[PDB]
Each structure stands twice: as structure tokens, then as C-alpha cells.
């Protein structure tokens, strides 16, 4: 509350100050155009008529010629002319070629594709750590694999043990698995890549395997990293059937990722967060520990856990201090943390029908009936016989 206000005051004088500084600083009159810049500039316009049709450098022959494939089915045996060093260019690089005559005018690309930008989602994690009402014990298993080598390399180095490779998150939805994922992400401040596995299920020829390779390249470039392959099972054990053109694709994608997860050796610097509902009643495709190490089963919320979650929610409510908190959680059997979240939302909705702006003392005892009854129907547990 107050802690948040203190911060607002500082954030609004930082932005203001920066913005004003920036005019001058960027230039607006500074206008570097002295001999070093002028050189670059003059040359660049002359040489480069535009548009410039990109290539891929297939091989070099030492005689300042290269062999490139252009987007046209005819390839072109080109001169290297001007700019980019011969050494700096290594085969497999994507390159700028001049449209009048194809010559290597430089590189600025590095095999830039839109696919990498899409995946790249470092962007502000919605979760900070321990905003969540989850239990200390569950998060301090994910943290142990992922955080702990980055914060304290001293202990791992001294022991001599390798840093762990991967974790698997599985529950039980409504244990806030993806909340957990973005709690971890905030702390590390690592490049947080995300890709969903259904984008790798397509009828399109061979595209799945191409995508799989991209992922390892991306993580390594932007290391240290966490790669969230979310619904890993979409590619794997989970299905899209084979009487739909799937007798080609699904096999090739599953194998491909599998082969790169082992690799010639575990990378040991790319953390993974693998999501899947549970691989207990599903087939396992996440191929043995040492490449996925510690595997994390989140408990179904017990009575003490939901107390902590419940405390967040009751703060905004007024007239729930007279209501005894303890008795609402007990009376309900042990159930999802999602069901306490559902209850809070329903509770407010319900107060409005009574016509009271925020919950009445009565409204809260009533709220429990509607949510418990709905949820037990949705999910029925074996009846004791």
C-alpha cells in the first residue's frame, strides 16, 4: 500500500529527468559528421543502390569470391567487394547482396527471421516472487534447480557437481503452475523465451524439425536463459492423430526435439520449464532424469496452504473480520487453490445481488455454498464404499 506510494514518487521524477536529458544527449545539434563518420556515410550511399536482395553464404573460396544462393533458383558465383572482412564471414551466414551486381556489401542480418522475435518474450513478468499465496516448500524446489547455481556458484563449484538441466512442472491445474513459472522468471532476470508446442504441429512439410533446431540456437545466443516449452506434450505424448496427415509430421517433430534434448551432451546452461498436465497416466516422452533432473509434483492444497492464499483476498473485503476465517477453509474438504480464488470472485458478485457494495457478514458464509456445490459436481472423487 504505502510501500507502493513511496516508489511512485521516485519513478515519476526518474522518467521526467531522463526525457529532458535525452534531447541534447541523443544530438539535435551534436550532429557528429566529422571525418570518421563522413567516410562511412559517403561510401554507403554510393555502393548501395537499393533494394538489396539478401542471400545465404554457402561457401567461401579464398580469392575473394563466394558462392551464395539467392532466393532465385539460379545461384550466383559472386565477388566479395568492399566492407565486411573475409575472416568475419563464416559459411552459413545470411548476407546482403547488391541488386545491380551481386556482391557482398556487408552483413547486418545474422540469419534474422521473424520467428525468433515472436519467441522472444523476455517482457515484464506479471509475477514477482511471493506475491503468490503458494507454499514456500513447493517453490523452493524449482528455485533449488534454477536459481541456486546463478546466485551462488560457490557451493556448486566447490562440490564439483554439474548445474542441473531442466525441471518438469506438473500438477494439478489451479496450483498456479504458470504463476510459479513467472515467479522464477522475475528473480533470475534471464532472457525468458516462450514457445507453444502446437505451432510445431502443422501439415506443412518438415517445418516442425526446423523450428526445433531454432530453439537451441536462440537460447545459447541470449544466454543465461529459461526456455519455456509450454505444453511440451503437444509435440510429444499428446495427440493430433495420424489419419489427418499426422502419419508424417508428429513422428518427426517428437524424435527431433528428443534428439536435441540429450544432444552430444547436456548444455547445462539453458534452463527449461516443461509444462504438461501430468505424465503419470500419459506416456512419458521427457526421457529420464539428467536432462530434466528434479521433477516437481505440486501438492493439491491442504488446509494450511489455503489460509495463506485466503489472507491476500480478505484484505480488500470489509466485514470479513467479524466472519471467522478459520471455519470456511476447514469445513470444505482439501481442494484446489483455484477454488478459494473462484470463491472470492463469486463472493463480490453475490453481494451485489443482495445490494451491498462490498460483502455483508452473511454473504461470506453463503458464498461457500455456491462455489463448493459447483466445483464438487465438476470434479467427482471416488465414493467410499
Amino acid at each position: 500500500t504505502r510501500c507502493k506510494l513511496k516508489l511512485l514518487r521516485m519513478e515519476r521524477i526518474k522518467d521526467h529527468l531522463l526525457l529532458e536529458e535525452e534531447f541534447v544527449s541523443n544530438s539535435e545539434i551534436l550532429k557528429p559528421f566529422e571525418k570518421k563518420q563522413e567516410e562511412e556515410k559517403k561510401q554507403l550511399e554510393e555502393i548501395r543502390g537499393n533494394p538489396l536482395s539478401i542471400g545465404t553464404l554457402e561457401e567461401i573460396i579464398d580469392d575473394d569470391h563466394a558462392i551464395v544462393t539467392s532466393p532465385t533458383m539460379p545461384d550466383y558465383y559472386v565477388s566479395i567487394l568492399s566492407f565486411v572482412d573475409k575472416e568475419l564471414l563464416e559459411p552459413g551466414c545470411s548476407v546482403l547482396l547488391h541488386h545491380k551486381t551481386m556482391s557482398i556489401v556487408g552483413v547486418l542480418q545474422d540469419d534474422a527471421d521473424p520467428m525468433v522475435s515472436v519467441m522472444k518474450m523476455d517482457k515484464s513478468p506479471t509475477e514477482s516472487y511471493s506475491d503468490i499465496g503458494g507454499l514456500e516448500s513447493q517453490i523452493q524446489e524449482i528455485k533449488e534447480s534454477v536459481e541456486l547455481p546463478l546466485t551462488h556458484p560457490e557451493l556448486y563449484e566447490e562440490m564439483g557437481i554439474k548445474p542441473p538441466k531442466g525441471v518438469i512442472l506438473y500438477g494439478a491445474p489451479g496450483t498456479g503452475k504458470t504463476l510459479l513459472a513467472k515467479a522464477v522468471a522475475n528473480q533470475t532476470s534471464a532472457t525468458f523465451l516462450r514457445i507453444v508446442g502446437s505451432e510445431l504441429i502443422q501439415k506443412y512439410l518438415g517445418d516442425g524439425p526446423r523450428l526445433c533446431r531454432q530453439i537451441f540456437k536462440v537460447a545459447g545466443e541470449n544466454a543465461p536463459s529459461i526456455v519455456f516449452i509450454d505444453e511440451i506434450d503437444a509435440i510429444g505424448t499428446k495427440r493430433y492423430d495420424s489419419n489427418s496427415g499426422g502419419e508424417r509430421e508428429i513422428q518427426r517433430t517428437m524424435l527431433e526435439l528428443l534428439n536435441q534434448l540429450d544432444g552430444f551432451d547436456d548444455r547445462g546452461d539453458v534452463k527449461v520449464i516443461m509444462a504438461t498436465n501430468k505424465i503419470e497416466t500419459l506416456d512419458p516422452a521427457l526421457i529420464r532424469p539428467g536432462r530434466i533432473d528434479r521433477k516437481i509434483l505440486f501438492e493439491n492444497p491442504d488446509l494450511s496452504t489455503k489460509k495463506k492464499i485466503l489472507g491476500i483476498h480478505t484484505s480488500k473485503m470489509n466485514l470479513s473480520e467479524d466472519v471467522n476465517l478459520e471455519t470456511l477453509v476447514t469445513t470444505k474438504d482439501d481442494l484446489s487453490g483455484a477454488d478459494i480464488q473462484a470463491m472470492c470472485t463469486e463472493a463480490g458478485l453475490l453481494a451485489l445481488r443482495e445490494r451491498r457494495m462490498q460483502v455483508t457478514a452473511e454473504d461470506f458464509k453463503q458464498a461457500k455454498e455456491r462455489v463448493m456445490k459447483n466445483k464438487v459436481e465438476e470434479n467427482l472423487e471416488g465414493l467410499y464404499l
Binding site: 537499393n50 533494394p51 521473424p114 522475435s117
Partner: protein, 50 residues
């Protein structure tokens, strides 16, 4: 200019030059295509009401 441009914005181009013309907000998406078949959803609550 490069300032105005935004990543992933669809653009018009003149001839084989490929000089910028206008930016297009305009995007082909299936949801939009489904809406056009669908049109303005009719109708009053009361008629449904019972």
C-alpha cells in the same frame, strides 16, 4: 520514416522500387472474415426473456 514505423506493421509499396507509400493498419485475419458473414447481431432481451 524509421521513427514512425512499428515492428510487425503491414505496409504498402510502390512498384519494383519498394519505396514506402502508406502504412496499412489493415490485416487479414479469419476472425474478421467470420464477423463479415455474421453482421450486426440482432435483437432485444425481452424476446429471449421467459
Amino acid at each position: 520514416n524509421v521513427k514512425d514505423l512499428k515492428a510487425s506493421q503491414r505496409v504498402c509499396l510502390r512498384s519494383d522500387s519498394y519505396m514506402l507509400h502508406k502504412v496499412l493498419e489493415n490485416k487479414a485475419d479469419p476472425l474478421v472474415s467470420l464477423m463479415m458473414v455474421e453482421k450486426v447481431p440482432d435483437s432485444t432481451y425481452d424476446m429471449v426473456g421467459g
